[PDB]
Amino acid sequence: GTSKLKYVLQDARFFLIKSNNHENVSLAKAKGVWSTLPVNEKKLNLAFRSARSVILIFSVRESGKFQGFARLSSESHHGGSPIHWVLPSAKMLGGVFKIDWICRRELPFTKSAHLTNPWNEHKPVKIGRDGQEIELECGTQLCLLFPPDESIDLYQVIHKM
């Protein structure tokens, strides 16, 4: 079903995350973590304190697809297990956010062509720089377009809200 998913997304904030390569998204899916440049780290930390759920929607550059979406479970923190990201300078990154995956399945951009983002000049939601905020209604509909991920149980995610 979709009911627990809709509950998690209620009054959520949404951010577009653009990765240079698949390896970083694979590490995030395996380890439940994400890191970003300080400008976006500050935005995500502010958003995490401000909303019931903050959702990151991932897309690998040049892939023509989104690779899934996840919910922030913490603010960024330093000094944890180092993560062997594939960089385009590791010192340039901010802290590490813990994330809980909501869907690990892909969605092609062709299926989201009817969704425009008011916070990016009403361009198709696939278009945007890393860290671009997606307005509530467009973000909710985007997440509902993904194929259901039957491997994830949202009961545990609901308890953290």
Q: Residues within the annotated binding site?
A: 18-20, 34-35, 85, 130
31 CB contacts (<8 Å, ≥6 apart)? 83
Helix (H, G, I), strand (E, B) or coil at 86: coil
DSSP state of 112: G
Cα–Cα distance for residue pair 142/161, rounded to 1 Å: 21
Structure tokens at 90: 């590791």
Annotated binding residues for RNA: 18-20, 34-35, 85, 130
**φ and ψ at residue 16, rounded to 5 degrees:** -85, 125
**φ and ψ at residue 5, rounded to 5 degrees:** -60, -50
30 CB contacts (<8 Å, ≥6 apart)? none
